[PDB]
Each structure stands twice: as C-alpha cells, then as structure tokens.
Amino acid sequence: QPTAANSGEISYADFEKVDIRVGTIVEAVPFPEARKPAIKVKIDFGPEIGIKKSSAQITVHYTPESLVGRQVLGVVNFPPRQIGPFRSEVLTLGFADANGDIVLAAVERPVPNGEKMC
Amino acid sequence: GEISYADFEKVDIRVGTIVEAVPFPAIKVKIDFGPEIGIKKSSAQITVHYTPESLVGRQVLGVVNFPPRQIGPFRSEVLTLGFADANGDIVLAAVERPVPNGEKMC
Fold first, then answer.
1. What is the DSSP string of B31-95?
2. How far is residue B103's CA from residue A68's CA, in Å, rounded to a whole number?
3. Which parts of chain A fold into alpha helices (H)?
4. A27 burial via Cβ count (<10 Å: 0-12, 13-18, 19+)
5. What CA–CA distance (Å, rounded) separates B101 from B81?
6. What is the tally of structural domains in chain A?
7. Which of A4, A24, B40, B55 is 20 to 30 A from A109, alpha carbon to alpha carbon?
C-alpha cells in the first residue's frame, strides 16, 4: 500500500520572487573554454534592465549567426556566476529535447524587451 | 532582490501540450504534461491573441506545483505562463521547437 512524502507545492510569492524576463540576443560568439560546446551571448532586456551577459549549451540547434534577434527567457536576479573566465549575469532558460539537446524557451510572438513572465 | 539557485529550483515549470480548450475574458484548457504529471487544468486570459482552435495542439509552459484551487465549479491546477505585449495583452510562453511533454525548464 502506498506511502508518500511531503507536498512539493509552493506559494505564489515563492514563484514571483524568481525574476524571469524576456530579452533579445544582440551578440553571440563561441565559448571557447566551455566543457561542453556553448555560446556566449549578450541579451538586451530593455532600457531599464539593460544588456546582460549569459551563455548556453545551444550549439546543436542554433548558431551565433541565427541567434542574434532571438528573444530568450532568462533569470535576471541571480548573483553573477563565474564560469571559467566568463562572468555570467543571467541564466538562459531551456529544455532538453528527445535527444538531450537544448531547446530554448521562447515567446509565441515578440513582446517588449524586459517583460516579466507571469 | 537576489535569489539563490535553490530558490529557483523550488519552482516547477514544465512544458505540456494543450489537448482541450473552451471559452470561459478567459479560456479553460487541459494541458498534457506527460506520464509523470498527467493532464492538468488551467484558466488563462488569452482571448485577444488566441482562440480555442489556435490553442489545441500547442505546447505551453506552466507552473505545476501550486495547490489546486476552485473557481466555482472549475478546478484550476496550473498557471499557464506568458508575457504582456506592447498593449498589455497576453502572449504565451513557448518552446522554440517540440520538446517531450513534462520536460522541466532549466
């Protein structure tokens, strides 16, 4: 007969406090020191937040040339993360596909840079 | 204003596929989040850019770990995620290409 652990549920506050924004990639280059292939990006999160640095394991489905102009979703309120010689400011969000390759989170149509996910 | 990775990990956001949509201004949907999570109900104010017909078959993102809540006879189970456009109307969060239902955003 079944037994169970505690609820994994959260309050709205514990969701809201995670600041996820949409922004547009303005620069993309290879990330030479990455353990697994990656691309370093600069993302324009709009006039208030500004342009922020990030990286992602996204060389399978994407290229530096095709990424410029793509809107991505990122967590903007982590402390900076030192990734080898690169100091990342934002965590860029994605999903593993059927093969384990990274597919970016997106918006169904473009929206203003800097909008919060809700 | 800053959070930890642990704070982020507490939030369970998954991709799923809308399998049903009816008008509610709001639309009631059922979303298939795959074998572990199953079918979940949601209500979203997305009538400006979407219809039931354009919604069914679409993959959406949802917070799957809020408690279920009653809205009259309707049991709302997940928050369907989106962003305000230039006019304040909701545009859905999405995936750039198909992903298995139930994958976590990370």
1. EE--TTT-EEEEEE--TTT--HHHHTT-EEEEE--SPPEEETTEEE--EEPEEE-TTS-EEEEEE
2. 26
3. 12-16, 46-49, 64-67
4. middle
5. 15
6. 1
7. B40
Burial label for A91, CB within 10 Å (0-12, 13-18, 19+), is buried
**Obtained via which technique?**
X-ray
| Residues near A103 by beta carbon (within 8 Å), at least 6 away in sequence | A61, A94, A95, A96, A97, B95, B96, B97, B99
| C-beta atoms of B94 and A107 within 8 A | yes
Range of the domain at A28: 1-118
CATH number at B32 reads 2.40.50.140
Token representation of residue B71:
């809205």
**DSSP string for A24-46:** EEEEEEE-TT-SS--EEEEEE-H
Residue A32 Cα, gap to closest chain B Cα (Å)? 22
Give the residue among B12, B15, B85, B96 at the shortest CA–CA distance from A56.
B96
